[PDB]
Amino acid sequence: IQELILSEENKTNIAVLNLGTNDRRNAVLILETALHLVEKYLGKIINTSYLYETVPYINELMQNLEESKYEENKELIDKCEEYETFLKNGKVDNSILKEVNVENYLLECNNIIVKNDEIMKNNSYFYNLTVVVKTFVNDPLSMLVVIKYIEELMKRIIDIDILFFNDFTIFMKNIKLEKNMIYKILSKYIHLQEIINNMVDNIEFLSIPHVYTTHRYSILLCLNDMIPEYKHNVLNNTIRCLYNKYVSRMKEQYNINIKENNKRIYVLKDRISYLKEKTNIVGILNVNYDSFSDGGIFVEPKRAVQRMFEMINEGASVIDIGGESFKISERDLVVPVLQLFQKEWNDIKNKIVKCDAKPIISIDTINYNVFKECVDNDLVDILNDISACTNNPEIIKLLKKKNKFYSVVLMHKRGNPHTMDKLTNYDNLVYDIKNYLEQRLNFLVLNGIPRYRILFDIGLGFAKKHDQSIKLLQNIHVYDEYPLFIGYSRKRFISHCMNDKDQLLYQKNICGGLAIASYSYYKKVDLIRVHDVLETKSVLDVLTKIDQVKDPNSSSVDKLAAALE
Amino acid sequence: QELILSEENKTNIAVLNLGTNDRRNAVLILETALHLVEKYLGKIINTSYLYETVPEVNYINELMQNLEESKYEENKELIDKCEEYETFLKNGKVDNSILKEVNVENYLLECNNIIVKNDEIMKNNLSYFYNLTVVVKTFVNDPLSMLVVIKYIEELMKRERIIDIDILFFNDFTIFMKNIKLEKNMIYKILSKYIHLEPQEIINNMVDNIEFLSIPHVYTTHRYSILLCLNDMIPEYKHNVLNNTIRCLYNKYVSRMKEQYNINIKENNKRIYVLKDRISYLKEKTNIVGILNVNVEPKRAVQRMFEMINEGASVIDIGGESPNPKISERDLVVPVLQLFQKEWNDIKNKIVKCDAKPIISIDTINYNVFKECVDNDLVDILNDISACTNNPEIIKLLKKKNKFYSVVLMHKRGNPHTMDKLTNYDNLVYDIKNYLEQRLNFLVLNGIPRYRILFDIGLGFAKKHDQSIKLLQNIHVYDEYPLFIGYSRKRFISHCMNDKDQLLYQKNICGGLAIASYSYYKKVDLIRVHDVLETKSVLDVLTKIDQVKD
């Protein structure tokens, strides 16, 4: 019924979308622009999967955008009933579109694939990300209209499909839309010309669940991040069970490991990172230590920015700056130093020789006010929050802006520098800490921090005995699935693992450090937060070389050649 | 009668088993046997490794001073071939046995009877073993005579249980003799054919202890420990009475133990190498070798040595070579080692600190230097960067009436000026390995215990930087062998990185520590380094991470 598609009785529905692009260079910019528009025109993003590389400007737009009929709020949430109900297949309001039969849907899907399987033989990088939206849109077909519009607004390849919509089984085998009925639907949610034309024909049909849902690997891979337990009448088994079957079966039958050519992405600034493919160095700039070790009482902002440069040319991708330490204010330590850096940089950016050399800037803070000022003056790109956004969750709201997002590091601790040493009792150390972080992430994701921008840090030496810091290292494979940031540098636990008497122990500690760096390298930790950037980079370089083999067959081939001589 | 005291000068090949189970004196006992073997039976021309195997103190020093002279001569000349040993390896043509031979059938019957009877004996009867094998070119006439002499040695070594020497093979003979009762006269009479005998108390305790002779020895096919050792020495050997080659037999014994009992027998039967006089379990530790270049006043040098022990180095490797014509290698190194020997000795009232004595390794290719060192008990290991290629005479100095000495064999080409040009290899990784193997075979032919030989790929000697890295990447190739390496402060390290240039010294030290990491996980046996504290700190931490607490 066309009349209740336009009726302004606003509804709350659960949609799950696929979002893809081809443009490797700017997948992060493309998909994050989609993402922000999805958050604008459809509802609130309440889940996301990792970004994946898979195998089968707009800065002008972001100012000239029309408003929406519905108000957004950055406000934090704890749960979601709508969502809770989506996952178990509890009762929801009836489909205001025609539901095709259960057993009818099966054969219907086939013909759209097998026919497309022929259009194929007329005849290469995909970048996938799935989302969940709490939608004020009232029906899939309406949303598709808006999705098509969003698609169109971004053109001068950005496919945004729709994978599910409540528990509905829908096929509309052949529809065309009124060149005008679109205007009505669009004006329903948006405040409005030259675009609608190219739209009208681009909505040839509609399948919920989307056709390729369980045939495309890239979609299972993504859906498994977000909603593993979810079942649907439409499919035999739960999304995790199907995903697993696709893996095992791809191995038994075709002798391929599918995970190799389909990679997980985490994002530090604006660029793609292949989970587990590198160990990045993070250089510690502690303004307290740098300033008050002379025994001196003054900040030396010029000194600090120099140390910042030292660090960059010593091979650190990320610099992590901190005002807290373990009568002058945190902010007054950090912001001026971040300020002098930003300037000093742009006064050598003229030489575009250092333009793709610019280091990522991470602020170690639990303070909202400090973070706000930093973001507001484009001074940082990552929040490093040792309280896991526990000291003040509101800080999460500062991790998303008009278009752009910021990546966060979440660390586990108990208590504080003075109290933590005795807060050492765990039921199950490794798993408690893992579960802790998995949960902070869930919370960030529920609030539409994109899953692929959150990094775990086990917090070595925070509320952990030296034996515990070791145990956490021994079991680091538990973070095999996740971006992992760690910080062993200079901590006392290193020394404890060892059989003028006070200067030896700093060498022993820095050198013992370099061991954990090696271990980190082989365990494929994602970032390590270090003081001794040159020493670390050296170690890492030698280890990388030893690993870069020219021919991966050569040792057997060569072995045989010897045996025949 | 006496076709057994025949005047005809016999050269035969006998393969021997040497077993003990005093872990703390394992080396001394076994080598003491090895010596009396060389003294009294003939010439050692192969040995296996040493193994801690799963079943089935100082009067030795007094013994060795007062041995009877052998009536057979000792010839330390280098040989590079042995016809009789080739004759034995192939299964070809030797003289008839003067002892009555049995056919295959009768041996297998009589073999089996001894096993089953000895099984039920063990079964109703209610502790590792240290194991080794040797091939002896022997002047003893026949296995029985030999068993007599080898019993004398078992007896000699007992205090007026400690060792068991058994004949595994003896030429290609099959021999089963059931009821050996040997006249008290006949024993004195055999022994005296091979030994200038001075007594006769022990001759008594010998009369009983020889009851029967089996050749091959009975448990040859039956004990892992035996097959394991033989696998080192004589893979291809196939005795008439054996189902297959030693190697085949070994593999089968291994693979059958993986299924029929699901065991994986390797795990509890460990290969052993020796640096000074203790046991080392191959691949169980990464020792640090401290570099001392006397390139340095004697007192400043010995200072450096004590600092290095405290920074936690197990071996020091002292070197005169790098040259300069002013002072001779001898005059650089010998003083230093003499000062060290003395100054350590002044602390010879602290009978606890004197376990932490470092093994001393002289980096030298010159006979004269090593001779002076060895003569004055100044060193334990010879680090010959030429693989004893330069002057093989040196090999003669790696053994004495009593001591044996371990040797690192490095691969290099040419000399320091030439070497940067001698850089073409057909199959780098295997060329070098094969080179080292041949070298080993040469010392082993020449009586050097195979467990005293350490292999070293010689990084940065006649290798381009990429080649030094290629070798490290393929270090797994030396999984079976004692492995010594030196990467320390070499140029290839710096080459990997992407460019006060005391800075470049650092990147090199620090990249050094990456290689220590890789060495540790690739279980390299020894690493020779300048930076002992830094190397120890890496290894200590990595070791902690690995040690899983309960």
Ligand SMILES: COc1ncnc(NS(=O)(=O)c2ccc(NCC3=Nc4c(nc(N)[nH]c4=O)NC3)cc2)c1OC
């Ligand atoms: C005797 O008294 C003491 N003296 C010195 N150090 C002590 N503690 S410690 O060495 O174990 C140690 C050192 C530093 C820290 N914190 C440094 C940071 N660590 C991290 C970070 N961010 C992220 N994401 N992860 C991090 O691990 N920011 C700062 C924690 C423990 C100490 O005991 C309390």
Ligand SMILES: COc1ncnc(NS(=O)(=O)c2ccc(NCC3=Nc4c(nc(N)[nH]c4=O)NC3)cc2)c1OC
């Ligand atoms: C003559 O020209 C040169 N001068 C300085 N550096 C050079 N390059 S280098 O740094 O790579 C280098 C440095 C030292 C060495 N040799 C040191 C040793 N190395 C070992 C040892 N013993 C054992 N067993 N194993 C060892 O690896 N003794 C001494 C080899 C290559 C160089 O050649 C291009």
Ligand SMILES: Nc1ncnc2c1ncn2[C@@H]1O[C@H](COP(=O)(O)O)[C@@H](O)[C@H]1O
């Ligand atoms: N679940 C869905 N989400 C988006 N488009 C759909 C869906 N089911 C069917 N379609 C139709 O299939 C086409 C999508 O193909 P594409 O060009 O890859 O976006 C559009 O014409 C849609 O009308």
Ligand SMILES: Nc1ncnc2c1ncn2[C@@H]1O[C@H](COP(=O)(O)O)[C@@H](O)[C@H]1O
């Ligand atoms: N090939 C052999 N090597 C050593 N002993 C042997 C051999 N063949 C038979 N025997 C006898 O087996 C017993 C070994 O005793 P034991 O050396 O105490 O284990 C002695 O009675 C020897 O006479």
Ligand SMILES: [Ca+2]
């Ligand atoms: Ca919204």
Ligand SMILES: [Ca+2]
């Ligand atoms: Ca001899």
Ligand SMILES: [Mg+2]
């Ligand atoms: Mg589509």
Ligand SMILES: [Mg+2]
């Ligand atoms: Mg015996």
